[PDB]
Design a protein around this ligand. Structure first.
Ligand SMILES: C[C@H](CCC(=O)O)[C@H]1CC[C@H]2[C@@H]3CC[C@@H]4C[C@H](O)CC[C@]4(C)[C@H]3C[C@H](O)[C@]12C
Ligand SMILES: C[C@H](CCC(=O)O)[C@H]1CC[C@H]2[C@@H]3CC[C@@H]4C[C@H](O)CC[C@]4(C)[C@H]3C[C@H](O)[C@]12C
Ligand SMILES: C[C@H](CCC(=O)O)[C@H]1CC[C@H]2[C@@H]3CC[C@@H]4C[C@H](O)CC[C@]4(C)[C@H]3C[C@H](O)[C@]12C
Lengths: 268, 268, 268
């Protein structure tokens, strides 16, 4: 009969509404669990002076110069001179071991990026008792923060775990091109880290055989490109959009049921 | 006349509805073609023992030791000893050529990551007849899987193409920091691959000139950080959301047409 | 009284509607500012011949050969021969300095990818007056474009800034595995760049002591895998979806107000 058919149609519409609700709930849960990633690139005319933390240990810093896009030939490799840069020593306890004390050297990085400003560091090591010579190094956002901070040690304990300390080797003029990655944690705070592309270049040993005992390290720190990579974890599980969608679907289903009832009545 | 104006308004609303339908269809097709990417990081207290597959060939494995965050100095480089690790040889046919037989060596990787556990491998090569000496290597998820698999050869034919085999050279204590990337294929299966950051460090030749003929290889395998990168291809082209949006728009347009008709009648 | 309660309910519904409108506006602005990223991998049976631009300078190109997945042993390192490849010299003004003139050499890269085709380049440098010997190099999409372009110099000024020029060092058979990243700029144009993974391998000096003065360079260019990474900045801030959502919410709110008024009248 017409009434039974209308009742069945209304029940089917109610079942469809319940299924739509279930699908929206499960999809909202899924989208909440899995935020999408948005990568943007910010133009910068001048980078904040990035702090470069080396750990020479027993290797003195022979030279620390600044240059623009090209390194001039060495007047006399292995001889100290031309410390035309700002440097600050420090000694800090390891955050993890808490016993070993690490002696770090903080150097101002290159500020100009459009001009390809770079910092050239020549170390030296004499009669090293340990094989596999290398110097660790790390990067943090601003040397000015290290300058003006109330306590400088705690800054280093924070940066040691905030960033990851790489290593560079002796006999290679390791060219380090840096870039900044700022990740939004969706908690009102952005974590800034350094992505460094290292290209090692061999060194020619033209020194006298006697001087071959000492092992020379060379490194260069510059800025890859004036792009800062902002990575934001966008969340598409917006409750208001889901509520609006569900209300629209419910109203459409109710009016479809009313249309079906009107059509059934008209047919009768 | 009022009737003509109402008819034109209703026709305009119908055209708007058709345009909305077309836009929704094309946007749904586009979103279906281009899924978005969601990157998440999973904390892990202990990594599954990762399998390191080397291909020494003619270079014997002088030493295979385990260490925690620091490599002790070599008592006597170039002298075998201290094989304090699990190793399994194997010979398998190349999946591509099917003729050349590769002799691989599977080593258990570092399990502890919070403690920075690492495996130190010292090989050696004597009177090498080939220039550009180096050893290939590759990584797969779990050495236990290789242990307990029914057929071990097929596991290697699968891993050779599933992962990409890198190379590490002689005279450099290549430091390999591993990380796991698990990509969801949206087919109920996740593909797990290794992203390895390599930092080479030169080696000091303090051996006698006569011993200089043999070439020594040194490599280290550890875990970068206790973070596993899950990359999921989220799909935003949800048919139910599109249907709900279209139904809501249709109902809104129908009621707008009815409001316009009522207003026209009231004006008359 | 019932009328006052109905008026308050209608006012509350209107306030909810205004809040929904504000939320939709702010969310649309946010989503417009932050597009999501979609990464897809396109299969390719054969890569377009990629153009490899070196800048040898004073380093002669001793050999430029092609090979399939394996480099045969050198018959006589440091001796020219076997230039079985296409090469084109050029001289162009630096886009930035505009004064220094760079002499570039364009070589056809490897076309076959399934067969692991690769190009092997052996240079040579004799009595170098500059320390830290190395040759720059860069990649652009197609060597055929450089062949058939009307002006070839302008192509180089475009590519120098479009891509980033890396460096490869002496004594290392730097193995360069290339991959293509095509980024959609949402402006009808796609920017194509090269991501190159470099694995350096030491070289054995078996040459006579007298020949040790000359420094030999070795490099290999191949294709990592037949996957092209398409990165598209998807935009989820679709105005039509927002309009449909808002219209659905408005209709639902108006009909809820009418339901409330009907219920109030029924109660009275
Ligand atoms: C875990 C989150 C948030 C927990 C909370 O805020 O209570 C999950 C658990 C259950 C989720 C709800 C499921 C269906 C809910 C009814 C609606 O058709 C619109 C989405 C709502 C309103 C969702 C809101 C949010 O997505 C919730 C609540
Ligand atoms: C290729 C896919 C899927 C093929 C299929 O499942 O038939 C495409 C081809 C045509 C696509 C349809 C276009 C408009 C359809 C009508 C609705 O206003 C809601 C989206 C619908 C329901 C879409 C569903 C899905 O997005 C489809 C079907
Ligand atoms: C800056 C953009 C685009 C500028 C423009 O096209 O005018 C911003 C500025 C204000 C934005 C509008 C805010 C609310 C608008 C009313 C609707 O409830 C649906 C979204 C609309 C239509 C939005 C469209 C677009 O998102 C706009 C217009």
């Amino acid at each position: 009969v017409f009434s039974v058919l209308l009742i069945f149609i209304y029940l089917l519409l109610m079942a469809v509404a319940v299924f739509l609700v279930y699908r929206t709930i499960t999809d909202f849960r899924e989208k909440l669990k899995h935020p999408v990633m948005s990568v943007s690139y910010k133009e910068v005319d001048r980078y904040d002076a990035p702090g470069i933390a080396l750990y020479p240990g027993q290797a003195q810093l022979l030279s620390c110069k600044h240059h623009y896009e090209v390194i001039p030939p060495l007047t006399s490799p292995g001889q100290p001179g031309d410390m035309n840069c700002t440097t600050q020593r420090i000694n800090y306890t390891d955050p993890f071991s808490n016993q070993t004390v690490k002696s770090a050297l903080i150097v101002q990085g290159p500020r100009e990026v459009k001009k390809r400003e770079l910092v050239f560091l020549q170390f030296r090591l004499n009669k090293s008792s340990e094989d596999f010579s290398a110097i660790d190094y790390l990067l943090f956002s601003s040397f000015q923060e290290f300058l003006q901070s109330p306590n400088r040690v705690g800054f280093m304990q924070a940066c040691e775990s905030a960033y990851s300390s790489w290593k560079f080797s002796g006999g290679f003029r390791t060219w380090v091109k840096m870039s900044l990655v700022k990740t939004k944690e969706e908690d009102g705070r952005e974590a800034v880290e350094f992505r460094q592309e290292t290209s090692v270049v061999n060194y020619i040993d033209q020194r006298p055989a006697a001087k071959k005992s000492a092992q020379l390290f060379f490194v260069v720190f510059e800025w890859k490109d004036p792009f800062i990579q902002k990575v934001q974890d966008i969340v598409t599980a917006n409750p208001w959009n889901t509520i609006a969608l569900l209300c629209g679907a419910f109203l459409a289903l109710f009016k479809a049921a009313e249309f079906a009832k009107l059509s059934i009545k008209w047919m009768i």
